[PDB]
Design an enzyme around this catalytic site. Structure first.
Site, short mmCIF file in Angstrom:
data_model
loop_
_atom_site.label_atom_id
_atom_site.label_comp_id
_atom_site.label_asym_id
_atom_site.label_seq_id
_atom_site.Cartn_x
_atom_site.Cartn_y
_atom_site.Cartn_z
N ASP A 198 0.79 -1.22 0.00
CA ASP A 198 0.00 0.00 0.00
C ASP A 198 0.84 1.29 0.00
OD1 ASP A 198 -2.12 1.83 0.64
OD2 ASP A 198 -2.45 1.03 2.64
N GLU B 15 -2.86 9.97 -1.16
CA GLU B 15 -4.07 9.17 -1.27
C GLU B 15 -4.63 8.95 0.14
OE1 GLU B 15 -4.42 5.85 0.05
OE2 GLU B 15 -6.51 5.67 -0.63
N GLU B 16 -3.72 8.76 1.09
CA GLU B 16 -4.16 8.43 2.45
C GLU B 16 -4.65 9.60 3.28
OE1 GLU B 16 -4.40 5.26 3.33
OE2 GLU B 16 -2.66 4.14 2.52
N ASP C 111 -3.73 -1.01 -6.49
CA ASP C 111 -3.67 -0.62 -5.07
C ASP C 111 -3.73 -1.90 -4.22
OD1 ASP C 111 -3.74 0.95 -2.75
OD2 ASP C 111 -5.71 1.82 -3.14
N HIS D 50 -2.99 -1.54 6.77
CA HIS D 50 -2.84 -0.45 7.74
C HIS D 50 -2.27 -0.87 9.10
CE1 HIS D 50 -5.40 2.72 5.43
NE2 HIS D 50 -4.42 2.20 4.72
C1 LIG Z 1 -11.70 1.75 2.78
C2 LIG Z 1 -12.04 2.43 1.47
O1 LIG Z 1 -13.24 2.52 1.06
N1 LIG Z 1 -10.99 2.89 0.78
C3 LIG Z 1 -9.62 2.79 1.27
C4 LIG Z 1 -8.70 2.14 0.22
C5 LIG Z 1 -7.24 2.24 0.55
C6 LIG Z 1 -6.60 2.43 1.72
N2 LIG Z 1 -5.25 2.41 1.46
C7 LIG Z 1 -5.07 2.24 0.16
N3 LIG Z 1 -6.25 2.14 -0.41
ZN LIG Z 2 -3.78 2.54 2.80
#
Ligand SMILES: CC(=O)NCCc1c[nH]cn1
Ligand SMILES: [Zn+2]
Length: 323
Positions: A127, A163-164, A210, A292
């Site tokens: 990620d 992105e985060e 991703d 995460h």
């Molecule tokens: C949880 C959601 O709907 N999107 C988060 C996708 C994501 C998190 N980190 C990378 N991609």
């Molecule tokens: Zn993430």
């Protein structure tokens, strides 16, 4: 009033025969990607950090050393965040900038911010350091073929910053880079001089990678307007499998299965999808177990799965571009 923006709707791939598939399988090196493209990114790289700068330099340097005519642009902008105004930098690498249409591969290169916990640092291996490295390895492996582009259609790679969420996801705290770039592209005429078409009309298909790198990923066929391309990924995976070109792979455990996913996953494709761009979202469901967590690291990556996906993606891109 040209109908060129409709060409993507009729576009067909030029399918590779067995000899060509063997060539592509043999032309990518998971060990070279691992050492040269992936490991330098396995660092803390949240927006604005020293690691973000190092990651951006690494990505640019790796593209710059290639023979194909990549044009690099850094898209730097400000946004409000939970921590106040901050700067972000998307990386865009494009072959044939004036070509009207581009197939676009993308991922995010920032890593989620976490204060160090018990001497551990979050590096976001799946990620999305792996997706970044896969895009770099694709550019390298296909360099000679891509050099030939120097069908008004070419290739573009986008590495999104921010992105985060800086905190936990929320509509305003997430997708900083993609919300900005989608709005910028939507308001930029394309090709140069156009009266009524934008860079978004030029985006044939946004293939967003991703959370790739864990064992046994299953990617849903999310959208009807890109289902035919999802079927091509299934076909490519099936044929590479039958030719004995994948490693530790079975059809029962295939990556592209027959199944949709009605829900919505928030990710970098959203600002593009809501502006009408067709998206092939290569995110697995469920997400990696280490999602995460500090365990989203190098040790938990599945080398052969990444190798197999590199072969599949490279064949997909060559077939789409008729190379
Ligand atoms: C949880 C959601 O709907 N999107 C988060 C996708 C994501 C998190 N980190 C990378 N991609
Ligand atoms: Zn993430």
């Amino acid at each position: 009033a040209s109908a060129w923006p409709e060409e993507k709707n009729y576009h067909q791939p030029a399918i590779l025969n067995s000899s060509a598939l063997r060539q592509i399988a043999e032309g990518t090196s998971i060990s070279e990607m691992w050492q040269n493209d992936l490991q330098p990114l396995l660092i803390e790289r949240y927006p604005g950090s020293p690691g973000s700068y190092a990651a951006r330099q690494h990505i640019m340097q790796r593209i710059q050393r290639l023979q194909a005519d990549w044009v690099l642009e850094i898209d730097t902008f400000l946004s409000q965040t939970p921590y106040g105004y901050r700067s972000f930098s998307n990386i865009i690498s494009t072959l044939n900038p004036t070509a009207k249409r581009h197939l676009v591969l993308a991922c995010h290169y920032d890593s989620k911010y976490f204060s160090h916990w018990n001497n551990r640092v979050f590096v976001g291996a799946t990620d999305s350091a792996v997706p970044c490295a896969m895009m770099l390895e694709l550019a390298r492996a296909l360099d000679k073929k891509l050099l030939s582009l120097k069908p008004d259609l070419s290739l573009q790679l986008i590495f999104f910053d921010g992105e985060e969420a800086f905190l936990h996801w929320s509509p305003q705290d997430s997708l900083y880079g993609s919300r900005h770039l989608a709005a910028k592209m939507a308001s930029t005429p394309h090709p140069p001089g156009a009266r009524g078409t934008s860079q978004l009309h030029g985006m044939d298909l946004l293939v967003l990678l991703d959370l790739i790198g864990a064992p046994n990923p299953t990617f849903p066929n999310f959208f009807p307007n890109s289902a035919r391309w999802f079927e091509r990924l299934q076909a490519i995976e099936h044929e590479l499998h039958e030719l004995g070109l994948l490693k530790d792979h079975s059809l029962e455990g295939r990556y592209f299965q027959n199944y949709s996913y009605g829900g919505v996953i928030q990710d970098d494709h959203i600002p593009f999808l809501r502006r009408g761009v067709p998206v092939l979202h290569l995110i697995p469901s469920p997400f990696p177990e280490v999602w995460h967590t500090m365990d989203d690291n190098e040790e938990n990556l599945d080398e052969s799965t990444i190798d197999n996906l590199n072969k599949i993606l490279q064949v997909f891109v060559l077939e789409y571009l008729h190379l």
